[PDB]
């Protein structure tokens, strides 16, 4: 993500940060 064409480096890097920490946490269950 280069900042020249993509000015939303504050949001796009923040949301992909929160995709993985909701995945690497072990409190969640993949089974219903």
């Amino acid at each position: 993500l280069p900042p020249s064409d993509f000015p939303e480096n504050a949001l796009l890097k923040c949301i992909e940060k929160e995709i993985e920490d909701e995945a690497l946490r072990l409190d969640k269950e993949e089974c219903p």
Partner: protein
């Protein structure tokens, strides 16, 4: 991650002084605190190297504020005019801060003088508008007066008067100081005779002199007659010459630079006169300095009554709203209401 109200996640400690080590923090730990992970799309980084040591400066302003944030809180200067004016506006705030702590609190005990004020509620008469001096400054005041009472009682505004009183009172505050940083602070409240204010008009005059020879070079080379002190007119002639030849759309009309040469010559003569009294070398005074000492005493007599006249103006409004309503009373008038007092048909 997402947080829940009332449920918090407990986390282990790093066991390094807590979150903030009160005993101290080293260089490489504070290096990471220096270059804090701010979003660089809205973060300006800046450093300056001054010989041995260097200073880092990092500022970040968020995107969700610039439509509602103040112009003073986020001093963003989108022009070169706002850069030069915004730096000068923020310089005067900082310079009064680092000078204002030298004479009030957090200052030397010999650099703190106080004023007493008592204003009458009825007659609006100022009583006891004195300064609160120590015993060293009061030994300077009678040393000033006993010399000047020895010279002005043989000839010539009454007997019990203080000769050049607002000049020696302004010099007694400067004489009793012990730090040079608080000495220039008292020079600034006394008509702005401090060395930082005098050096700015010396630079403004020498740039007007260097511009006066620039207009003298242009007008002599074009033709190949002038007023007396051309450097006062030199910002007004340069503004028209740059407007005439095409580089510049606006010519100047501001005549505040008129008389500026003899003004800053008088300001530097006022400055050298007052430090001549601080060293108590007033036993010999030339006729040029004595005519300067008379006009400086009346100029220093009205600058200490700036605060007392504003309070006097408010006290006039207080007695104005307490007046009797209407056009007046029948017992307290010498003139009829519907007639002018100088009217020829006054008495019907």
């Amino acid at each position: 991650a997402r947080r829940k109200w009332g449920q918090k996640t407990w986390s282990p400690t790093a066991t390094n002084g807590g979150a903030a080590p009160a005993n101290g923090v080293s260089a490489q730990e504070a290096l990471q605190i220096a270059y804090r992970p701010m979003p660089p799309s809205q973060t300006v980084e800046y450093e300056e190297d001054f010989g041995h040591n260097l200073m880092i400066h990092r500022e970040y302003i968020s995107k969700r504020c610039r439509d509602r944030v103040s112009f003073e809180l986020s001093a963003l200067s989108y022009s070169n005019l706002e850069l030069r004016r915004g730096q000068e506006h923020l310089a005067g705030i900082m310079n009064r801060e680092r000078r204002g702590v030298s004479v009030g609190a957090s200052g030397a005990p010999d650099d703190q003088v106080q004023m007493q004020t008592d204003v009458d509620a009825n007659s609006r008469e100022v009583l006891s508008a004195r300064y609160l001096f120590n015993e060293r400054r009061l030994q300077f005041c009678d040393r000033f007066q006993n010399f000047f009472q020895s010279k002005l009682e043989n000839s010539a505004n009454g007997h019990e008067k203080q000769h050049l009183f607002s000049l020696m009172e302004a010099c007694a505050v400067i004489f009793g100081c012990e730090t040079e940083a608080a000495r220039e602070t008292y020079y600034r409240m006394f008509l702005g005779l401090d060395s930082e204010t005098l050096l700015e008009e010396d630079e403004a005059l020498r740039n007007r002199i260097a511009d006066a020879k620039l207009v003298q070079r242009v007008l002599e080379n074009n033709k190949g007659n002038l007023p007396e002190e051309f450097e006062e007119y030199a910002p007004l002639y340069k503004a028209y010459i740059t407007h005439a030849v095409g580089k510049g759309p606006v010519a100047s009309y501001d005549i505040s630079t008129l008389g500026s040469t003899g003004l800053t010559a008088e300001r530097r003569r006022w400055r050298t006169l007052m430090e001549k009294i601080v060293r108590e070398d007033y036993h010999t005074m030339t006729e040029v300095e004595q005519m300067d000492a008379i006009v400086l005493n009346e100029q220093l007599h009205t600058v200490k009554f700036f605060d007392l006249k504003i309070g006097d103006a408010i006290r006039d409004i207080l007695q104005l709203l307490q007046r009797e309503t209407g056009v007046g009373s029948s017992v307290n008038r010498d003139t009829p209401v519907g007639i002018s007092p100088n009217n020829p048909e006054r008495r019907v």
